Design a protein around this ligand. Structure first.
Ligand SMILES: Cc1ncc(C[n+]2c([C@@H](O)CCCC(=O)O)sc(CCOP(=O)(O)OP(=O)(O)O)c2C)c(N)n1
Ligand SMILES: Cc1ncc(C[n+]2c([C@@H](O)CCCC(=O)O)sc(CCOP(=O)(O)OP(=O)(O)O)c2C)c(N)n1
Ligand SMILES: [Ca+2]
Ligand SMILES: [Ca+2]
Ligand SMILES: [Mg+2]
Ligand SMILES: [Mg+2]
Lengths: 814, 809
């Protein structure tokens, strides 16, 4: 009999949530419907009736608890102890405060729908309990003495969140009203009602693309945590900046970026010490029922992927919603792990103006039409429970009216009225750092010559691309800059060229040579730091995270590296919605760098192109910098200009693969110490040699590694009649430098744009249209030499590639 | 108290025993690992404990207590917690032959050719007898086909030893590692056979996952099995292979798992095999995931997960067969996490000890699962010394055969319908089932559709249903899906209508699947509301068109602006599948497009990006301006006998523009017109010779330009529409412009920013393909923008008016 009791306790803990009264609409009519002598027997000693009452109150009332899937026994025990105890009833003051938050939320929803037209799609009606729930999250974070709560959410209830959570005044919110305000960033200060603490509250910008902002929030919070010296890269483990992420039920289950972002939660390179997730589960997605939106019992089932506790709560019970919000913050503080709150509610009205929701959901909306809002329900429950008197409920209705009056009145009143060159000692210091190994450190025999060659390059020149990148990042760290670099296998490098982190052959201990540059020769810190990580196998979440990280710390140097540029299309939503367009749409600035390994080498259509043409198509004056450098020193100056220009603009770099090891693609020490970024490059025979520019009758304009192949062919046939000009900066077009360079070749009779990429790809679709328009005296008659237009970035065969590469070389010199 | 401790101990093994199971063949985690004669209710505590250790703590880690269905938990419990019959010596020798063939293939591949290391299955050979066990168990269930999707690793090994392709066809002439293949699997110890196919894929890991599901669902619908079938067998099985780093990191995995039990997307359960070699290129699992297992995402749909030791090919084969049986019993996904290792470096330039010295010092002391299983069968006494010798002569014989075989290879149409068809589709909207209650606001839509069918003024929404309805009447399977596609985002479609009193669904176009005499046409209308996914949903529909080339398959974006969420499918499959793999798709993407002041995410389907991806006959790209031209576009696409994707930029407010309606004769006596002139010149009293300014455009801006022309009586201006954007209708465009001899200036007019819409490609292409017609072509558009439009509807309205005033200035 005592074995049956242990099985009964486990059944309530494991599956009690399936019986919990969580749906305020009670749509599922079969949810609840599908010995007595032992009830008074004792089984710590407790009677079976007392065990069953504790289990029912904890697991089968307005809170459905999912936690037995958690592999950590200490986390399961922590939830058990706090959920399976008699809870102290909230004070009348706390209850009145919860009611006053529901009064503010409904008074805001009432004014919006009444004052303006076309506001229905933004309505939080049937879900107003999310306002005292969010208030409880922020208040509990303030109680923990934390510094900031950063929110990401979709558009539903956003302005209500602006007024009743962020604390933005109505005059600012509805200043020259109308849609753009449902996507803008905001900041405020939350002051505790019953406490003496305060906390910063911010709301990040987002597109309409639901859940796309999720990794952006995490990056943004991580950047703020690194700046506050809290968390993973901090001295304290408080993670004093809390991500609060809101979601819709259909989007949370359907968008892949949710899983990608959850997968980052405990990674050393991406953890934020746990996110508080709130799903506004109104059991609908426009006209779509949950049975067409997901293959699981709950919209939050994806969170089981990382063993996050999940709390399903009845949105018509704001006390249970506030209690669960505070429990979620406490769990996050104790275990530094994500918590999901599934708030079951409803969408009172139609999705938008042209929607009578009974057309597609007659049953749900016949039930919704018999519902009285959370505010009225809570006022009626408190009255029935004897917690408040008739005068107190009447005073609360007076508070609702005064709050509705205030917003109508306040809005009425508003209606009435730089050098990048470094010294040689800097290069030598970065070279020496590669050999300044910790005591007893064992280097892998294949990594040892790379280190020794870097010391040699630092003092003797012939600096290759891989070392020039580290010279640029190392010199920024020495100057006090925080440098964050990440991507797939970025510590070692996809092409075994980087070795930013080296691994002890016997212990596996990591050593980061560039980190030595964060300390000045005298021993004082520079203020700089090198944060280098291997990312998860994600593009969408990883690019979103790095974009968010550059927003969170505008003073950081933030670089994301694609394994091959070909895989960045997995992050297209981030490129389209944030990187290329965030500045013009929201005034949100990012200095994020995308490194895209690019080049035709015969490795197939998915190991060849970063789709230059797509980034050039997205570009519009002053949105991004787009470059394809051909020399290590020009890449070094490109990165240093980007980190020191004081301008927050994304940089897109088309980086090499085989050209990393091309012996002609090396730079002299003077190119680092006495030069700057060159947007346009001429052949060294004309700038440093005995070449005669006046013999040139044919000019080849190009970008990237094909220059070396064109230069080798010119050298082989002694073609003095042909010159090769490189466009290093593809966007913005270096109009003046390009015009001044071409004027130095007066006998040119024909000009060709030469590229490896197909005719419908690379720089030709934009340069072929733009160059004759911006420089008509220089580029009227410009012709293209390239691969034929293709539906894929290249052929699948390395043999076909080699024939096509040779046809480009023969056409340019034909 | 003692009996209570036993019940708690049993639960502990069932719930968490998989944490102590000996699943890692490398044993890298060094921290990983009384009265027992009393009989409890009746068996001894020692025997109860031994059954739990063998079931949960040996070479198989079982995760199943997360499953909400008690009958599924019970089914696994009964099959795992019992004394299993040891495999016969014949089955053991057969598992060994599959380990011999797979390892020999690997040794041949790393010796004969250079640049192959990156495809090596060494350290993971056990996936070959595991896949063989899956397919053999599906054949034992009498199923029709197993369709495989997998990444690069072991692909050619899978082709020869699973698909059964000959070496002459495999090594004939990197492309081979991405092509589709088909074969017949013949049972070794059984009398059944089953079709085995391998689908094509890009290098983009996990991208093929929803494509496989779509492909399988199309095959299931054709075989009348599953969700849309008469039987519940789901006789076409998706077998999906994965890598451990990709399975945890790619969002498309979760999106595809989310489709597994949906009425519009279910395939009756997928068998998932993760080749968990505990590494991702140079990245350790602790940098790749925030969960204990790479397969933890599968708990999202309550799938059972089996973690298996890849050095134990018997446990791997047993788990594969159990997985098939679970899939058949519950029509739900099963995940097999095969723990193994990657013997060599990721590729030619990789010494894996540089980044993982500890793992590769352990890997260097490992003997293959072939040498292991051969020696373990001697240790067990299951095979003799002569048997072990002959098994080595099987290996050498297999190694010789492939060297000798490749040595020998190296030596040697009208779209118009009759008025009765239109009337039938109109009548269908009022042919309600007995006792059906129409929603009052849906009632006038059905009555207006009968009226339009007989009297004309046919709007866009009805013209679409006239095209789909007429195809169904002709015997075509029509599959239509997308976010809120049954009703339509703009409340315009009503393909499915909902009973106000019962919630019963009624599909008017489904009545056209039955001829007037009562016989079936062979056609069907499959219309669904999709999940809130773009990547998986677009991938699924692309896959569905590949699986049934005879189906009319349409995917509709809520707004064209959200299709960038499916960019990997557009780039890797739709735009390029034909040229890269010879794989054909006739998939239709419907992208609601147009500048109306709803912001940068409710305005553009990015025409410029699709036009940039296009290269000679890869896709058809269109932006129709009339309901009848859209009708003929869809009917041409469904009847042309060409498998080519169609990209359609569809309207939003133009759905209700009273000028954007068509006459019955436009459906009954016309065809698709790639180029459209103004009706005043083709049917009216307009004089083409008065025209001095020619405006070329596409889409709804035509109506605004035509309204302005009419207002000012501008006989000097003509508006020509390009309905088919790609391929450019060169001949029809040249012949149309020749009819306006007094034209002194030509303008391309568009709503979209200068760096967007059709101008970036037309501005470069039109003066090149038709120099006598388009030299001097100028652009009238919005200024170049970093976003598709402004955020303000006020700014939009000013910009729309500046375009109209510039065109008539
Ligand atoms: C990636 C992505 N894919 C599609 C859309 C389109 N989309 C929406 C909007 O863009 C407006 C479109 C409708 C209109 O106004 O005409 S709402 C929505 C339904 C949301 O359901 P859920 O999460 O349950 O939340 P709620 O119940 O709280 O609304 C979807 C699909 C998008 N924005 N982002
Ligand atoms: C979406 C996406 N993002 C990135 C890549 C790049 N990528 C791969 C290749 O394309 C490049 C390397 C080519 C070469 O070797 O020359 S393999 C890989 C590691 C796979 O790990 P896991 O799943 O564990 O499998 P395995 O262990 O069995 O290898 C990653 C990251 C991709 N193809 N797709
Ligand atoms: Ca900058
Ligand atoms: Ca076709
Ligand atoms: Mg919803
Ligand atoms: Mg792997």
């Amino acid at each position: 009999k005592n074995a049956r009791v242990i099985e009964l306790i486990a059944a309530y803990r494991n599956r009690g949530h399936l019986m919990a009264d969580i749906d305020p609409l009670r749509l599922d009519n079969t949810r609840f419907r599908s010995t007595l002598w032992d009830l008074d027997r004792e089984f710590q000693r407790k009677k079976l009736r007392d065990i069953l009452s504790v289990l029912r109150d904890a697991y089968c009332r307005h809170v459905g608890v999912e936690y037995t899937h958690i592999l950590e026994p200490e986390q399961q025990r922590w939830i058990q102890e706090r959920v399976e105890t008699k809870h102290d009833k909230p004070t009348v003051a706390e209850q009145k405060y919860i009611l006053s938050k529901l009064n503010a939320a409904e008074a805001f929803e009432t004014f919006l729908q009444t004052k303006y037209v076309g506001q229905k799609r933004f309505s939080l009606e049937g879900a107003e309990t999310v306002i005292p729930m969010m208030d409880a999250v922020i208040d509990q974070c303030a109680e923990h003495g934390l510094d900031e709560v950063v929110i990401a959410m979709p558009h539903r209830g956003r302005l209500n969140v602006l007024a009743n959570i962020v604390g933005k005044p109505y005059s600012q919110i509805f200043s020259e009203f109308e849609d753009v305000k449902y996507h803008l960033g905001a900041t405020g200060t939350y002051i505790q009602m019953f406490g003496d603490n305060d906390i910063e509250v911010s709301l990040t910008a987002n597109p309409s693309h639901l859940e796309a902002v999720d990794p952006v929030l995490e990056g943004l919070v991580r950047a703020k945590q690194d700046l506050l010296d809290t968390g993973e890269e901090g001295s304290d483990n408080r993670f004093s900046v809390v991500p609060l992420m809101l979601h819709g039920d259909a989007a949370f289950a359907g968008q892949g970026v949710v899983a990608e972002t959850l997968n980052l939660a405990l990674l050393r390179g991406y953890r934020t010490g746990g996110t508080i997730h709130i799903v506004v589960n109104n059991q609908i997605g426009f006209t779509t029922a949950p049975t067409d939106s997901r293959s699981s019992e709950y919209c939050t089932d994806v969170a089981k992927m990382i063993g996050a506790p999940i709390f399903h709560v009845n949105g018509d019970d704001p006390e249970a919603c506030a209690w669960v919000a505070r429990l979620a913050v406490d769990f996050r503080q104790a275990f530094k792990k994500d918590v999901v709150i599934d708030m079951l509610c409803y969408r009172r009205r139609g999705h938008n103006e042209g929607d009578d929701p009974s057309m597609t959901q007659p049953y749900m909306y016949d039930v919704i039409d018999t519902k009285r809002g959370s505010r009225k329900a809570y006022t009626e429950a408190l009255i029935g429970r004897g917690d408040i008197s008739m005068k107190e409920a009447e005073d609360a209705l007076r508070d609702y009216q005064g709050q509705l009056e205030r917003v109508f009145n306040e809005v009425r009143e508003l209606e009435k009225h730089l050098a990048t060159a470094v010294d040689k000692a800097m290069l030598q210091r970065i070279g020496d750092a590669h050999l300044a190994l910790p005591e007893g450190f064992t280097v892998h025999p294949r990594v040892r010559p790379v280190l020794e060659k870097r010391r040699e390059m630092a003092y003797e020149g012939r600096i290759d691309w891989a070392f020039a990148e580290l010279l640029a990042l190392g010199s920024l760290i020495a100057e006090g800059k925080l440098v964050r670099l990440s991507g797939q296998d970025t510590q070692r490098g996809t092409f075994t060229q980087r070795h930013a982190v080296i691994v002890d052959r016997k212990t596996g201990e990591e050593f980061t040579p560039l980190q030595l540059l964060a300390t000045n020769p005298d021993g004082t810190p520079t203020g700089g730091k090198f944060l280098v990580y291997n990312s998860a196998l994600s593009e969408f979440a990883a690019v979103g995270f790095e974009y968010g990280y550059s927003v969170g710390n505008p003073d950081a140097m933030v670089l994301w590296e694609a394994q091959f540029g070909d895989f960045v299309n997995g992050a297209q939503s981030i490129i389209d919605e944030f990187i290329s367009s965030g500045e013009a749409k929201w005034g949100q600035l990012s200095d994020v760098v995308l490194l895209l390994p690019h080049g035709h080498e015969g490795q197939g259509p998915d190991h060849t192109s970063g789709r230059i043409e797509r980034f050039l198509q997205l570009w519009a004056e002053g949105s991004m910098t787009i470059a394809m450098p051909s020399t290590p020193a020009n890449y070094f100056h490109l990165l240093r200009r980007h980190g020191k220009d004081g301008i927050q603009r994304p940089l897109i770099v088309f980086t090499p693969k085989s050209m990393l090891r091309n012996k002609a693609a090396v730079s002299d020490i003077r190119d680092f110490t006495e030069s700057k970024f060159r947007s346009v490059l001429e052949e060294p025979m004309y700038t440093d040699g005995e070449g005669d520019r006046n013999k040139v009758t044919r000019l080849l304009l190009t970008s990237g590694k094909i220059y070396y192949e064109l230069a080798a062919r010119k050298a082989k046939e002694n073609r003095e009649d042909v010159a090769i000009v490189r466009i290093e900066q593809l966007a913005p077009l270096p109009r003046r430098r390009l015009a001044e360079t071409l004027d130095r070749y007066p006998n040119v009779k024909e000009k060709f744009w030469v590229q490896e990429e197909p005719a419908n790809q690379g720089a030709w679709p934009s340069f072929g249209l733009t160059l004759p328009e911006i420089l008509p005296d220089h580029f009227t008659g410009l012709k293209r030499i390239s691969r034929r237009a293709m539906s894929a970035p290249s052929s699948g065969s390395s043999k076909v590639h080699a024939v096509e590469q040779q046809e480009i070389l023969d056409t340019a010199f034909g």
